[PDB]
């Protein structure tokens, strides 16, 4: 089956950011022989790399790619936001041992100070600058409603909450 | 020739710190010689301190002098703006200073004001102010849209922009408000949108809901002080009222006094009751020599039946 | 006589953004007139740019002169220590300034409170407080120390390291200051150093300079309100005192009332000379009958000679 990989791997972007979805596959032969299923309709992009330059609100939704007679890929959920702070993650569903990532992205990559990551109402971590948290191994207790609060231009704000679930991989 | 006005700061200890006594030295030079009044400002407030106004030194056909302000570390590190203003020949030249960060604006803020009860009930033309502060001058000039909660149209709102002393802009939008529409409970909304921003600033105002209590007014005079004897300070306690929207006036000879005379504080929550405000006015000897009563008047929504309760006092 | 030398820098406005030509003026005054060698040092290294414009000015038996260094904009943020080196009679004197480091290094803010007139004039056990709160929790401890201006030894402080709900760290240090030394104006300094703080935090407090003025306490009761049997509140206007530091208490039958009973407003500046405080206390019916000379006391540093001004409140 084909798979969709994002560059950058954040499935939540801003209104006006850039992300390229790549239809990564095995024994793909010619790269210009695939089609891009949007939410519902067909996109007209080619070369197995659909870029969303200056992304609007309508670019969010279901994304999948199809290569010849094998069916479409498992659809990734893009969600274009527009806020002062956005909590970006590598994946909402993360297996055991998979590397979990969280980043408190400011609006139009503004520098954010005093960023506090909260996991279900308690302070997971705090730093004076904009910082990521990169969990090398993921645990089932390392899940919940993650959200970050920071300071953009010396004013306190609040990111949209993110439901991250880590499940037991067989 | 117009004067040239600069400000020199104090030392900075060499290593990394601020000295505990910070000297702000306003140099004025290259003016036509005469009388110059130095006024020092702290965010638009004139203070009365022992500023060291040096003598005027004449250099050729020009002249120069200086003034000095002293500060502690706390007031300088409180991130305030201090302005040396020369009141020379009926003209004002301004130069300001401030503790300077590297690059960090304070970010656009929006504040919505409920109408004063004096505007609501006495003048019967209430207005609502959306104040946009800490606006950088990097274009924008924020779009200011007015609406209600029920979608009804609003009156035409006037707008103004003032270039403040501390580098920023302050954009005021004043909207006249229907009185019957306001007292019935219509929620007004001010939307401040900037192009270089995410989701815009929405501010919502309404008539404050809850229990209502009539404001209890008491007024007191001064029982004399040794020395002084030329001025008296009257107080007015208005207490036990809900909600907190109260206008305090200080009438005399059935004539409204200017608001610069009184010093009415903000409402604060009492112990198991409503709010209290305190008013203080200074009369000269020429005002209470006519024996007429200084009448402290509270305008409030629950001050039945005239939306006004007043207490008149005079000095002895 | 040794010369008294000071160093001034050009103030930064528009607030935030530095001026392009930062000028340093090292004013040397109060010396016996003669020959003085003036040079400038960049961490002990001599440049090629200086101004030798300012001549001597013989004010009586002493004299005064200065020198100006003009800089480019980017040289000031290079964090290079500058020193105006003055040689006179074979003697070497130096003052240094660099770019003023931030009051909050990378976000870590420290507030050093001054002792109130309470604990300064009643129990004579005043506690200065260094509250530094923005710190991230790490394995390294918060190296907090205390100093004075005259180098006298300080007492043992109490540290209160605690992690807050929002992941920050609260460091509170309370030190018992000497009353006599605080009346001297001995500048107490709190110095905070952390493993992940690039430069030291220095906060300094002194006895508040300026004029001195005794408080002018007046304390009134209120007329009896219809429908009110238990409230019977009392007001106290305390006015015209220098400086802002004042503590207000209430005394029932020579016993101090709790501070939660009275609502003391902040000292706001009056028009004429000083500040006014509007403390209000409500008394229930049982102690309304047991009135026994209600007292509004306002302890203040300039209330000569008893450092305390109190009046009497009577219902009748
Ligand atoms: C495939 O499905 C996806 C969803 O599964 C479709 O995406 C949807 O597209 C519409 C049209 O762009 C979006 O409508 C916007 O709705 C948001 C509210 O959700 C509005 O933004 C809001 O703006 C205010 C302004 O002050 C701001 O305060 C809010 O914070 C902001 N909302 C957010 C969440 O930040 C905006 O004005 C539009 O009305 C849908 O939201 C969007 N769905 C999702 C889940 O995002 C997609 O269109 C569809 N594919 C096709 C081809 O139709
Ligand atoms: C630069 O200077 C301007 C004024 O010269 C500052 O604007 C002031 O901002 C404060 C809040 O930051 C405003 O206070 C607010 O007042 C409303 C009622 O008007 C009240 O409801 C709020 O709770 C708050 O107290 C203040 O009104 C405003 N002044 C003016 C004249 O508009 C600005 O903050 C300064 N910026 C910096 C970085 O110093
Ligand atoms: C995380 O939460 C804590 C609450 O415990 C915040 O600490 C509080 O910070 C404010 C200022 O940011 C302090 O207010 C200060 O009080 C002193 C008292 O004299 C006053 O002089 C200052 O002008 C200022 O108003 C407050 O005291 C402090 N709370 C405690 C308990 O120490 C902290 O700021 C929060 N951090 C973030 C990043 O949100
Ligand atoms: C948070 O993670 C992002 C993405 O992993 C980091 O952004 C990358 O930073 C490296 C090094 O500076 C660059 O080479 C990449 O081009 C960046 N990628 C993107 C998409 O921006 C970011 O630096 C991390 N932040 C922190 C504080 O570690
Ligand atoms: C997205 O790519 C375009 C194309 O170069 C660029 O102009 C734009 O600035 C990019 N936007 C972001 C947010 O990187
Ligand atoms: C998708 O491909 C699988 C091959 O594993 C096939 O079994 C399935 O029927 C396909 N789904 C379709 C054709 O809808
Ligand atoms: C989780 O830890 C194991 C340790 O053996 C490591 O091999 C694995 O790569 C880690 N998972 C990551 C980095 O996603
Ligand atoms: C996260 O999951 C919980 C569990 O039902 C749900 O109540 C909550 O609304 C979810 N939050 C988001 C942001 O999806
Ligand atoms: C840390 O505190 C100790 C205790 O007095 C002191 O001797 C030492 O110099 C301090 N170190 C730093 C780097 O502040």
Are B167 and C102 inside 8 Å of each other by CB? Answer: no
Q: Is B228 helix (H, G, I), strand (E, B) or coil?
A: coil
Q: Is B208 helix (H, G, I), strand (E, B) or coil?
A: coil
* CB-based contact, C137 to chain A, within 8 Å: yes
Task: Give the Cα separation of C154 and C161 in Å (integer).
Answer: 21
Mutate to test the interface with C, among B4, B5, B6, B17 (most CBs of C within 10 A): B17
C130: closest CA among C149, C143, C117?
C143
Residue A127 with chain C: CB contacts under 8 Å? 136
What is the torsion angle, in degrees rounded to the nearest 10, for the CA atoms of residue C30, residue C36, residue C37 and residue C40? 20
Task: Give the Cα separation of C110 and C240 in Å (integer).
Answer: 31
Two tokens, residue B244: 């907190």
Two tokens, residue C48: 């090629």
Task: Give the Cα separation of C195 and C200 in Å (integer).
Answer: 10
B175: closest CA among B113, B224, B122?
B113
Task: Give the Cα separation of C276 and C296 in Å (integer).
Answer: 14
Place of tokens 């609007």: A56
B74 sits in which H/E element: helix B73-77
Give the nearest chain B residue to A157 (CA atoms).
B107
Q: Is B272 helix (H, G, I), strand (E, B) or coil?
A: coil
Task: Give the Cα separation of C280 and B278 in Å (integer).
Answer: 9
Contact status, residue C176 vs residue C158, Cβ threshold 8 Å? no
Whether CATH 2.60.40.10 fits A83-166 = yes
For the domain made up of A3-80, give the CATH fold. Answer: Immunoglobulin-like (2.60.40)
Are B106 and A83 inside 8 Å of each other by CB? Answer: no
The structure's method of determination equals cryo-EM
Residues with CB under 6 A from ligand 9: C 143, 193
What is the torsion angle, in degrees rounded to the nearest 10, for the CA atoms of residue A56, residue A58, residue A59 and residue A61? 140
Cα(A157) to centroid of ligand 4, in Å? 22
Task: Give the Cα separation of B287 and C94 in Å (integer).
Answer: 59
Question: B14 CA to chain A: closest CA distance, Å?
Answer: 26
Question: B245 CA to chain A: closest CA distance, Å?
Answer: 28
Mutate to test the interface with B, among A80, A130, A155 (most CBs of B within 10 A): A155
Cα(B133) to centroid of ligand 2, in Å? 6
Task: Give the Cα separation of B187 and B206 in Å (integer).
Answer: 5
Instruction: Kindly report the three-state secondary structure assignment for every residue of chain C.
Output: CCCEEEEEEECCCCCCCCCCCCEEEEEEEEECCCCCEEEEEECCCCCCCCECCCCCCCECCEEEECCEEECCCCCHHHCCCEEEEEEECCEEEEEEECCCCCCCCCCCCEEEECCCCCCCCCCCCCEEEEEEECCCCCCCCCEEEEECCCCCCCCCCEECCEECCCCCEEEEEEEECCHHHHHHCCCEEEEEECCCCCCCEEEEECCCCCCCECCCCEEECCCCCCCCCCCCCEEEEEECCECCCCEEEEEECCEECCCCCEECCCCEECCCCCEEEEEEECCCHHHHHCCCCEEEEEECCCCCCCCEEEEEECCC
* DSSP assigned state of B288: H
Largest CA distance in chain A: 55
Ordered by where they begin, the domains of chain C are 4-97 (2.60.40.10), 110-205 (2.60.40.10), 218-313 (2.60.40.10)
Mutate to test the pocket of ligand 8, among A77, A92, A145 (most ligand atoms within 8 A of CB): A145
Contact status, residue C293 vs residue C314, Cβ threshold 8 Å? yes
Q: Is B297 helix (H, G, I), strand (E, B) or coil?
A: strand
Contact status, residue B2 vs residue B93, Cβ threshold 8 Å? yes
Question: C252 CA to chain B: closest CA distance, Å?
Answer: 18
Contact status, residue C135 vs residue C168, Cβ threshold 8 Å? yes
Task: Give the Cα separation of C208 and C205 in Å (integer).
Answer: 8
Cα(A96) to centroid of ligand 7, in Å? 10
Provide the chain A residues 94-123 that lie in CB contact (below 8 A) with chain C: 113-114, 116, 122-123
Two tokens, residue B97: 């200073």
Task: Give the Cα separation of B205 and B187 in Å (integer).
Answer: 6
What is the torsion angle, in degrees rounded to the nearest 10, for the CA atoms of residue B127, residue B131, residue B137 and residue B143? -60
In chain B, the N- to C-terminal Cα span, in Å, equals 55
Q: Which residues contact B303 (CB under 8 A, 6 or more apart)?
A: B214, B215, B309
Task: Give the Cα separation of B47 and A105 in Å (integer).
Answer: 44
Each domain of chain A, given as residue ranges in start order, spans 3-80, 83-166
Transcribe A71-128 into DSSP letters: -BPPPEEEEEE-SSEEEEES-SEE-TTS-EEEEEEEGGG---EEEEEEETTEEEEEES
Contact status, residue B280 vs residue C276, Cβ threshold 8 Å? yes
Find the CB nearest B199 among A82, A108, A154. Answer: A82
- Would the CB of A59 count as within 6 Å of ligand 5? no
Two tokens, residue A93: 């569903």
Find the CB nearest A113 among C107, C165, C166. Answer: C107
* CB-based contact, C15 to chain A, within 8 Å: no
Can you name the residues that pair with B88 across neighbouring β-strands?
Answer: B91
Largest CA distance in chain C: 85
How many whole angstroms from its chain centre is CA C1? 32
């Amino acid at each position: 089956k084909p798979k969709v990989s994002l560059n950058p791997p954040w499935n939540r972007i801003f209104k006006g950011e850039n992300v390229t979805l790549t239809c990564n596959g095995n024994n793909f032969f010619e790269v210009s022989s695939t089609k891009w299923f949007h939410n519902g309709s067909l996109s007209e992009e080619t070369n197995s790399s659909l870029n969303i330059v200056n992304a609007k609100f309508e670019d969010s939704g279901e994304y999948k790619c199809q290569h010849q007679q094998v069916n479409e890929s498992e659809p990734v959920y893009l969600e274009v936001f527009s806020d002062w702070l956005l909590l970006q993650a590598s994946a909402e569903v993360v297996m055991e041992g998979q590397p979990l990532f969280l980043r408190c992205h400011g609006w139009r990559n503004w520098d954010v100070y005093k960023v506090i990551y909260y996991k279900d109402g308690e302070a997971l971590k705090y730093w004076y600058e904009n910082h990521n948290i990169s969990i090398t191994n993921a645990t089932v207790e390392d899940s919940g409603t993650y959200y970050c609060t920071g300071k953009v231009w010396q004013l306190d704000y609040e990111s949209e909450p993110l439901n991250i679930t880590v499940i037991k991989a067989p | 020739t117009p004067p040239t006005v600069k400000i020199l700061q104090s030392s900075c200890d060499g290593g990394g710190h601020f000295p505990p006594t910070i000297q702000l030295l306003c140099l004025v030079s290259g003016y036509t010689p005469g009388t110059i009044n130095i006024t020092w400002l702290e965010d638009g407030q004139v203070m009365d301190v022992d500023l060291s106004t040096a003598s005027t030194t004449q250099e050729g056909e020009l002249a120069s002098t200086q003034s000095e302000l002293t500060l502690s570390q706390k007031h300088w590190l409180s991130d305030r703006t201090y302005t040396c203003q020369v009141t020379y020949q009926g003209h004002t030249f301004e130069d300001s200073t401030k503790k300077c960060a590297d690059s960090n604006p304070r970010g656009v803020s929006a504040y919505l004001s409920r109408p004063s009860p004096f505007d609501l009930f006495i003048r019967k033309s209430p207005t609502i102010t959306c104040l946009v502060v800490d606006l950088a001058p990097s274009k924008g000039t924020v779009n200011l849209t007015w609406s209600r909660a029920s979608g009804k149209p609003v009156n035409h709102s006037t707008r103004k922009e003032e270039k403040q002393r501390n580098g920023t802009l302050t954009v005021t939008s004043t909207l006249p408000v229907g009185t019957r529409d306001w007292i019935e409970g219509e929620t007004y909304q001010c939307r401040v949108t900037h192009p270089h921003l995410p989701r815009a600033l929405m501010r919502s105002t309404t008539k404050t809901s809850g229990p209502r209590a009539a404001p209890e007014v008491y007024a007191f005079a001064t029982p004399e002080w040794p020395g002084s004897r030329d001025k008296r300070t009257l107080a007015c306690l208005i207490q036990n009222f809900m909600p907190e929207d109260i206008s305090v006036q200080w009438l005399h000879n059935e004539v409204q006094l200017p608001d610069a005379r009184h010093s009415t504080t903000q409402p604060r929550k009492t112990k198991g009751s409503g709010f209290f405000v305190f008013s203080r006015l200074e009369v000269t000897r020429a005002e209470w020599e006519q024996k007429d009563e200084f009448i402290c008047r509270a305008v409030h929504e629950a001050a039945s039946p005239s939306q006004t309760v007043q207490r008149a006092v005079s000095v002895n």
